[PDB]
């Protein structure tokens with residue numbers, strides 16, 4: 001019923017799908033993490049997080065908008081679906097964890113970057129229509 005959260009972003013740039021070395025996650029068990037098939041995108045958030053509201057979405061939380069969305073493991077399934085210049089709704093199912101789309105593994109090339117967010121395997125993306133985009137902006 002309220003078992004979901006989402007947020008719109010404009011997809012600005014999509015990095016190649018390729019194996020990358022990942023950072024040693026700061027404060028976790030030290031290991032040499034193997035290269036992993038991965039990509040990431042540069043997005044710009046178009047509005048704040050929206051709670052699931054029955055069959056729809058609630059008002060965006062009041063709103064720097066740059067984000068790097070990081071895909072590995074089964075989230076690689078999104079690669080060919082995602083095109084620069086389009087707007088997508090990023091959806092996380094389940095209980096509304098308050099600061100979910102603020103921040104959280106990380107590619108070594110993005111060590112110490114200010115706004116990385118890992119796409120979880122149960123997260124989904126939907127392509128937004130022109131009217132979808134306007135409705136969020138207008139609220």
Ligand SMILES: [Hg+2]
Pocket residue numbers: 013014015016
């Ligand atoms: Hg690039």
Ligand SMILES: [Hg+2]
Pocket residue numbers: 002052053054
């Ligand atoms: Hg509600």
Ligand SMILES: [Hg+2]
Pocket residue numbers: 067068110113114115116117
């Ligand atoms: Hg980043």
